[PDB]
Write an enzyme that holds these catalytic residues in place. Structure first.
Site, PDB file in Angstrom:
ATOM      1  N   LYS B  77     -16.576  29.653 -17.180  1.00  0.00           N
ATOM      2  CA  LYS B  77     -15.516  29.455 -18.165  1.00  0.00           C
ATOM      3  C   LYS B  77     -14.606  30.668 -18.412  1.00  0.00           C
ATOM      4  O   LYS B  77     -13.429  30.491 -18.740  1.00  0.00           O
ATOM      5  CB  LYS B  77     -16.069  28.851 -19.462  1.00  0.00           C
ATOM      6  N   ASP B 111     -20.119  25.241 -27.653  1.00  0.00           N
ATOM      7  CA  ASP B 111     -21.529  24.936 -27.418  1.00  0.00           C
ATOM      8  C   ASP B 111     -22.213  26.044 -26.602  1.00  0.00           C
ATOM      9  O   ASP B 111     -23.441  26.034 -26.436  1.00  0.00           O
ATOM     10  CB  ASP B 111     -21.686  23.588 -26.704  1.00  0.00           C
TER      11      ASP B 111
END
Lengths: 366, 357
Positions: B77, B111
């Site tokens: 990410k 998350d």
């Protein structure tokens, strides 16, 4: 359920008397190894250090003898089977085992027939040995035996009869057929009047223990513990016999692991010299398979079958157990523990292996 | 091994029209990669060939992009987060990002992976990060963010309500909101994130061409749609939407990502939880002599679908429907490694979310 309880019932050995077995000592194992060294392709099986698993588990060392690298057999059992079959031929043809030439043995009359019942590994080793030395082999297997195991034997140019009976009846059938046709029975179990062949097999197995000690001395380590899977008692007997000859029964905490679902020669050594007996759940072996096959940290990966991984699975089951502290105390496992484990077989049943390690068969969650 | 039936609901994309994206093509992905190449310690994540698994499953090639190796972050990410954050700083300091080397504060809900990427970028560029996580978040993931010098607030609420609190505090203190999702009036940052993500796809294409192979398929985990759309956007620009059988996998949002998916995706799969569990195990204990890959729940669901198809009673038809055959070259993205070590070992050792009972 990272914290989980699997059946790991520990019993101190009430039969312990520390009496060693001179028949299954260093010398007889070293003679068996010298036979094995003559077979083309011989190489001591790896002794793999699971350092990162040992650090997780709170012990100094975990050493796994990987018997899946035993020639092409994916299991240790040829060490006994081939040695005993070699000794039989030396008897019949008046040769000395110390100086055996396979080439000379090849051009010596009629081909002998070796008969045995097996669950898998033992018979494969008999078939392998009969294929090497140019002899006949007829292996019998009980009902429900894995087809892959029946196929692995047929691939070694031997007969394999799947019966509609259990193990014990199939042994009697193998004995009855061998008596009626004059075959030489090669079983890894002993009984009244059948003790010579099983003795050689157990001495044969000690080869792996002789290798393991050399490998540990090379590492500059001394084992405090050893877990030996029970099976029929031959491997555990033979290997323990050798290890106590090396280390003394008092300086070696030996744990004999018996999965929930025998050889009197091996069991005498186990009664005399074993420290503890663990009776364990099915899912313990399964757990051991997964830990070995998907290692922790940067540890090396090991492919271990159901019978092969249970030693290791016990260590894992203890580590995740709620009563970890008391269980480690009971087994005297601590920051200094150097634990020898023996992975007796690899993925000898591929279907079952990948069901365990991929599909999650016999999972911790009941 | 055993025959079993996990949920792998395949539906053809009826919205397919094959219109490529001007926003998410090769040119933006290459600008993103040129930025990433400048970061100390950059190295294209491995593209591993699972040849023996491919043979078992009955395809030509299975190629896994291993983003557990993306720097030290165990996930992909940062490719979006770091890029967007760099684009934000270059606007504030009037700098040129193409050739680059008061303190902003970046605020995000997560998350795990996205927030960690944001936190990593802030630490690297001498800026502040405030990361919000919902109730039940793994402590390891919280620690990972705290160890990057960031603030990590674990609420007593779910994701949606934690996003609202992020939005509230950001407006209150004047923090810069950095989310991987897009909504009305919030497009500039998610777009940069999606373009940054495309770096991995640019790498994969370089690696496949180095192998001399051409992918017939790609399986992309859906998530919030940012990875799938960004990566697919790049892939269809390279190979054309017609010659690439893309499969978007959704285990049991983002309009920017989802428009590319509606346009260019071949099929969508809705899959069972245990499908991701299966993929984690197959990748972590490989077949034959294949390399071993450590892949988290979100990482391994693409591969998991391949394993679930192979073992299905309706294996033949499912393969037909997915156009999988002995010639199929299948690209799979492992988006994360073992970011939650407890959950990973429960799957791979304890057999949590087992195929059966």
């Amino acid at each position: 359920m990272s914290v989980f309880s699997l059946k790991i019932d520990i019993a101190d050995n009430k039969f312990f008397n520390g009496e060693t077995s001179p028949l299954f000592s260093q010398s007889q194992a070293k003679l068996a190894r010298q036979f094995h060294q003559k077979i083309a392709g011989y190489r001591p099986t790896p002794l793999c250090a699971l350092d990162d698993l040992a650090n997780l588990f709170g012990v100094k060392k975990i050493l796994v003898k990987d018997e899946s690298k035993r020639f092409g057999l994916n299991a240790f059992k040829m060490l006994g089977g081939a040695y005993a079959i070699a000794q039989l031929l030396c008897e019949k043809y008046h040769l000395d085992i110390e100086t055996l030439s396979f080439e000379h043995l090849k051009n010596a009359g009629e081909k002998m027939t070796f008969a045995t019942t097996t669950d898998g590994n033992h018979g494969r080793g008999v078939a392998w040995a009969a294929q090497q030395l140019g002899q006949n082999a007829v292996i019998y297997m009980p009902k429900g035996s894995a087809q892959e195991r029946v196929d692995a034997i047929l691939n070694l140019g031997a007969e394999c009869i799947v019966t509609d009976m259990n193990y014990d009846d199939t042994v009697r059938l193998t004995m009855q057929h061998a008596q009626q046709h004059g075959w030489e029975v090669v079983q890894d179990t002993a009984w009244e009047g059948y003790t010579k062949i099983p003795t050689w097999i157990m001495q044969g197995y000690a080869t792996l223990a002789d290798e393991a000690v050399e490998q540990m001395r090379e590492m500059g380590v001394t084992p405090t513990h050893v877990l030996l899977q029970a099976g029929v008692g031959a491997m555990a007997g033979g290997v323990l016999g050798y290890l106590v000859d090396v280390y003394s029964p008092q300086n070696l905490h030996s744990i004999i692991v018996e999965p929930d679902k025998p050889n009197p020669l091996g069991w005498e050594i186990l009664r005399n010299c074993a420290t503890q007996f663990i009776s364990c759940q099915d899912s313990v072996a399964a757990l051991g398979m997964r830990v070995l096959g998907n290692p922790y940290g940067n540890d090396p990966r090991i492919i271990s079958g159901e019978s092969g991984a249970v030693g290791l699975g016990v260590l894992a089951a203890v580590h995740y157990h709620p009563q970890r502290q008391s269980l480690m105390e009971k087994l005297a496992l601590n920051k200094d523990a150097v634990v020898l484990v023996i992975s007796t077989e690899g993925d000898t049943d591929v279907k079952h292996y990948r069901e365990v390690v991929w599909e999650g068969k016999h999972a911790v969650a009941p």
